[PDB]
Symmetry: C2
Subunit: 204 residues, 2 copies
């Protein structure tokens, strides 16, 4: 692989890109200086599209369902986290949660999510005032407001690292998709792709 | 001011990164009850979201405009070079490795078209979809990136990088706001386009 000038196309969740990419880039550069990396944005909705269409060979993303012609590997289990920016003492109760306005990380413009689906089961609801298509930058949008966001704990970690937010366990149970490495069945055999995937796994 | 309506806007990665926070602060200050949906769309994907009705207004580099649609320039082009290592000469610029940001999966960008006019070329070694975290990405490397000035301002504010003017020029980073002609009369939509235009 040292003499390779091949171009590689991978898909990454926007939060995963912060931690995975810098150490990864250094490894491929040092051992395969001719290879070019193209990173596409990935989420659990675009993930089957990116694989089935050929836009990426492998992705590291939150994943829900994948095409039948796709292999996958869990890289990290997720639990939900509440993010807030106000200064009120104490953890949010369920009543507090349902009364405050919410920011939703929605990858296709929906104003409701799985949290709303779960709250509806118990006859409760919430008001979403903001839908954003990514995780990063969310702290700049919540700052100085009482808007709260419900995100996977991996995204929460990166957003807490960005500063200005508090993280807590939600006052109820909701979904949190796994972080996965997923690739298409055809490329399980490929040595160049096996090599890239083994290099990604060296850092996550 | 008392509006509680839902607005759906499309923004490229550079605009969502550097300009959405000031825009949102101003939108919420005037109309605290509005609901905002932001869709991510680069300069090639944007027109599809406008034609399909997924958004009512988009902000991106100049692209294809669907039928019935209108556009207006909202910010002039001012690119900046970012570096983590004096000012870079043109020969240094064409010799350093380049990271390309959010060009829909391609290995070419606007700068490649500009350099060709001098019979020059560059080497793109990396393509990423986001501007946030570029500092930690270029840290300890000779890789440079060429971003719009509003993205450079936010990235320099986080520390670790230096920003310079490029050794050539380009209108290619001009921001244009596009919308459908059917919504050209909606007072709520025209309020929104008015505020986007003002707060650039």
């Amino acid at each position: 692989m040292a003499t390779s000038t091949a171009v590689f196309r991978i898909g990454l969740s926007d939060d995963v890109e912060f931690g995975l990419l810098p150490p990864l880039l250094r490894r491929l550069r040092a051992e395969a200086p001719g290879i070019v990396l193209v990173v596409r944005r990935a989420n659990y909705l675009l993930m089957p599209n990116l694989l089935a269409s050929g836009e990426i060979s492998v992705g590291v993303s939150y994943t829900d369902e994948l095409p039948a012609n796709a292999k996958r590997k869990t890289v990290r289990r997720s639990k939900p986290k509440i993010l807030r920016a106000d200064s009120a003492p104490g953890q949010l109760t369920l009543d507090d949660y349902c009364a405050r306005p919410h920011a939703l990380v929605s990858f296709a413009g929906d104003l409701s999510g799985f949290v709303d689906e779960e709250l509806e089961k118990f006859g409760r609801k919430r008001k979403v005032v903001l839908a954003v298509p990514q995780f990063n930058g969310l702290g700049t949008l919540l700052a100085g407001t009482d808007i709260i966001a419900t995100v996977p704990d991996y995204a929460a970690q990166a957003l807490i690292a960005a500063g200005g937010l508090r993280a807590e366990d939600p006052p109820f149970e909701t979904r949190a998709f796994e972080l996965s490495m997923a690739w298409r069945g055809a490329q399980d055999n490929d040595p160049a792709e096996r090599w890239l995937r083994s290099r990604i796994s060296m850092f996550i």
